[PDB]
Write a protein that binds this ligand. Structure first.
Ligand SMILES: CCCCOc1ccc(Cl)cc1CC(=O)Nc1cnccc1C
Ligand SMILES: CCCCOc1ccc(Cl)cc1CC(=O)Nc1cnccc1C
Lengths: 304, 304
């Protein structure tokens, strides 16, 4: 019993972190096999960031200008290339701590763990969701760029995020490991609209099932609803519209608890319309949307 | 910017986890140097748990009855001893992944990371506080016993908790690494009062400073208070009384923000008396007490 915002064990990712320095800029890189991946803005000076011509800035750099250090040891750079917003530095040594891995592009509403790093050294690990608007609400300071987001299925690390920047609003933006930004963001110091965010309905419902499993049941009611009626409420409260695909993904939790998905929707509808009335659910005084249905099943079953 | 419930990177601890089996019971052990530490109730059957005579149960066990497996490899047990509520299994091989470590007994109100494990395999990592009543509000299922709590200062892991049991109320109890329970708990399947818990005032104040640093400032007011007046409010709301020692530990945050500790106390007093009025602070709709002043300084400065 108990339910926590749990991150994946970060060891397999810690073994991949390196420091990358180019000129005066230092950030983090991810060393997998014989390639080090890092944000391409490592080649910029603070002055270049207003509108960088990355192609031109990279033309002025050679392999020997990229200083890559894995803890105490220096890596020898034998190639460099830019792919979208990431640089790939080919090194002469395969990382001996390379775990089994994949590069994946996550969908908005999915969750992942972030290993925040500074100077190639891990500082902490936390779990977060990719917002529907493709931002993340992380905890990152200057020097954290190149820190990565990931999920782990048994012995395979699926890397889904590399941190690039903080928007003027304090929210975070980054790329997949092929350097493609999530969302409309560009790697420039410019005003960038993040766009309307919504609450991840399927995750709130999953977390309400997690609450029932762990004994917090006060919000259960005698009501039911339909997808159409619930979506009118979701619209008013800036929640993502619930679809049959979301209902299907909640099947295992509905089967375990015996609470039909639309009955849990009616509990959520009442909570949206009436608030918490000063009560809490799983130690929270708001409706939590950073746990997917898969996260709830994993945490409630003890998957390693 | 941003503030998250951040755990320490768990890699150094993952390398110490092993599975311990005795008879029919399997739980986790912590392998440091040539000793494996685990909860002594690994020697019990479910029937023995109502009132186990651990000394008698252990007398029936020999070194070869403790099956210790580090991933795929089996460890050879050459000695066993019980120290308080832990068993120490001497093995013939020092763990090659033993980090620099210490065993510490944390104080109530302090925080630490938990690497939840099942069958010797890490499942996830989360940050939590040792409650003033010596329980932890963790996320643990059957098989998680032997999972550990720790803090990391540079390259040194300070182990402070080993998980032993879930109380009938769903809260968690465990020991330091010398096997001494935190709180009044005993390792028996009996009704055990946890005792009155309180909110960790110094941590709520630290988190309010974290909020101001990250831009959430709506709760700041034109008021001040005294330790005596604030403690009358703390008493009414079941908060720990604030002392000058707590004020001194908040010095660095008060110096960084320029907000005097008693002025932040007046913000906290108003929040206690008036509630949040449907607003949030650092994404929370309640007053968070699981960040110490040291945690806030560390997260706000990027300590690795
Ligand atoms: C001090 C850097 C100012 C320019 O910023 C930038 C402009 C554009 C880009 Cl693609 C990158 C960056 C660096 C950046 O955003 N760093 C960062 C990340 N997360 C949290 C806090 C910080 C300060
Ligand atoms: C299924 C075990 C029942 C007896 O429990 C016990 C009685 C006494 C003791 Cl010192 C240990 C235990 C085992 C225990 O509490 N396990 C556990 C831990 N955390 C979260 C969930 C669980 C089920």
């Amino acid at each position: 019993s108990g339910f926590r915002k749990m991150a994946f064990p970060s060891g397999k990712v810690e073994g991949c972190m390196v420091q990358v320095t180019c000129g005066t800029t230092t950030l983090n890189g991810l060393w997998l096999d014989d390639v080090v991946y890092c944000p391409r803005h490592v080649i910029c000076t603070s002055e270049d960031m207003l509108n960088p011509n990355y192609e031109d800035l990279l033309i002025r750099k050679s392999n020997h200008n990229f200083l890559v250090q894995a803890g105490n040891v220096q890596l020898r750079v034998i190639g460099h290339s830019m792919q979208n917003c990431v640089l790939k530095l080919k090194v002469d040594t395969a990382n001996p701590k390379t775990p089994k891995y994949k590069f994946v592009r996550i969908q908005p509403g999915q969750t992942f763990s972030v290993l925040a790093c500074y100077n190639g050294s891990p500082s902490g690990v936390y779990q977060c969701a990719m917002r529907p608007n493709f931002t993340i609400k992380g905890s990152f300071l200057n020097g954290s760029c190149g820190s990565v987001g990931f999920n782990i299925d048994y012995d395979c690390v699926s890397f889904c995020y590399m941190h690039h920047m903080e928007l003027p609003t304090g929210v975070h933006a980054g790329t997949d490991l092929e350097g493609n930004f999530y969302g409309p963001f560009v790697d420039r110091q410019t005003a960038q609209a993040a766009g309307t965010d919504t609450t991840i309905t399927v995750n709130v419902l999953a977390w309400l099932y997690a609450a029932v499993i762990n004994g917090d049941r006060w919000f259960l009611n005698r009501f039911t609803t339909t997808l159409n009626d619930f979506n009118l409420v979701a619209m008013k409260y800036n929640y993502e519209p619930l679809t049959q695909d979301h209902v299907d993904i909640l099947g295992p939790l509905s089967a375990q608890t015996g609470i039909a998905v639309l009955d849990m929707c009616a509990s959520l509808k009442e909570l949206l319309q009436n608030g918490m009335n000063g009560r809490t659910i799983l130690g929270s005084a708001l409706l939590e949307d950073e746990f997917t249905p898969f996260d709830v099943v994993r945490q409630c079953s003890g998957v390693t």
